[PDB]
Amino acid sequence: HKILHRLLQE
Amino acid sequence: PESADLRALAKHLYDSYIKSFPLTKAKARAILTGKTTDKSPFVIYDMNSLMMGEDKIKFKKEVAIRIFQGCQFRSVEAVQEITEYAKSIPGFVNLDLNDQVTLLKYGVHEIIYTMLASLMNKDGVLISEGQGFMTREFLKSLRKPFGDFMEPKFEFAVKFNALELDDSDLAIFIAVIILSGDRPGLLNVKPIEDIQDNLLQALELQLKLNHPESSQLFAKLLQKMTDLRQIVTEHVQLLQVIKKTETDMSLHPLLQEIYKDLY
Numbered sequence: 128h129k130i131l132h133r134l135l136q137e
Numbered sequence: 138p139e140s141a142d143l144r145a146l147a148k149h150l151y152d153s154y155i156k157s158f159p160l161t162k163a164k165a166r167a168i169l170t171g172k173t174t175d176k177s178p179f180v181i182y183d184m185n186s187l188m189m190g191e192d193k194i195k196f197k198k199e200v201a202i203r204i205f206q207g208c209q210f211r212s213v214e215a216v217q218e219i220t221e222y223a224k225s226i227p228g229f230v231n232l233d234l235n236d237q238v239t240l241l242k243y244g245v246h247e248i249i250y251t252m253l254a255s256l257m258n259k260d261g262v263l264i265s266e267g268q269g270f271m272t273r274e275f276l277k278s279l280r281k282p283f284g285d286f287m288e289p290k291f292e293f294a295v296k297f298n299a300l301e302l303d304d305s306d307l308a309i310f311i312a313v314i315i316l317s318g319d320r321p322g323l324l325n326v327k328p329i330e331d332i333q334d335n336l337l338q339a340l341e342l343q344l345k346l347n348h349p350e351s352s353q354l355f356a357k358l359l360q361k362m363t364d365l366r367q368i369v370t371e372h373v374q375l376l377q378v379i380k381k382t383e384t385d386m387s388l389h390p391l392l393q394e395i396y397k398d399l400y
């Protein structure tokens with residue numbers, strides 16, 4: 128779930 | 138009283154919704170009913186129209202495949218938008234990042250359906266930020282499995298739009314969907330439900346105030362929330378089918394993240 132993780136960290 | 142705090146939460150959420158989402162229900166209806174000194178959108182009803190109107194399509198292979206790709210492009214952006222909005226819901230980011238992910242993973246399709254309804258009427262859907270209008274009859278008429286992909290979303294939207302909710306209602310409603318404590322695989326349900334309780338009260342008050350005309354709009358809207366789960370199950374499955382059966386078609390990574398271990 129990297130993209131989701133990344134979208135959430137931005 | 139507490140009403141003041143609830144009102145303030147509603148207005149925070151409305152504002153965040155306005156920033157997060159490019160096309161409001163308000164503008165979309167204005168477009169859909171021609172109530173705007175702005176040229177109407179390019180109607181796409183057949184393969185010809187699509188050709189003539191492919192210059193107008195937002196997208197950056199057969200027709201059905203191409204339409205679904207365009208529909209897939211916009212879906213990914215919707216998830217980016219829903220995710221940004223989620224971040225703004227008070228105390229969502231303070232949750233465990235593994236739960237943040239779980240919520241969104243199950244939440245987005247329910248909200249995408251909600252969002253689409255803002256863009257739909259009985260006969261078609263607004264696309265490319267209201268610049269195109271793709272007809273229901275046309276989408277329906279696509280070859281299988283693609284012809285029956287959008288029709289369930291059309292069916293929900295005629296029912297859902299009967300409630301005549303506006304953007305201020307929708308903002309809170311959306312927040313309520315995201316913060317569901319009953320999603321498969323949540324690590325820590327208690328702080329989720331604590332926020333949802335605030336949100337539901339915020340929603341009840343909003344609906345009473347914004348629509349004193351209509352009592353049990355709150356009850357009616359909560360019943361839609363429960364339908365939408367099982368409606369989203371059908372959609373999840375039909376995609377997993379389309380993934381396997383159509384080898385030519387690449388499915389977007391982010392989308393795939395959300396279909397993994399879903400039902």
Ligand SMILES: *c1ccc([N+](=O)[O-])cc1C(=O)Nc1ccccc1OCc1ccccc1
Pocket residue numbers: 204205206207208209211212215249252253262264265271376392
């Ligand atoms: C369309 C096709 C596939 C997927 N998907 O793989 O999950 C999603 C969608 C979709 O949900 N589209 C969509 C969602 C929310 C707002 C706007 C959307 O696009 C509508 C549309 C665009 C272009 C052509 C037809 C419909």
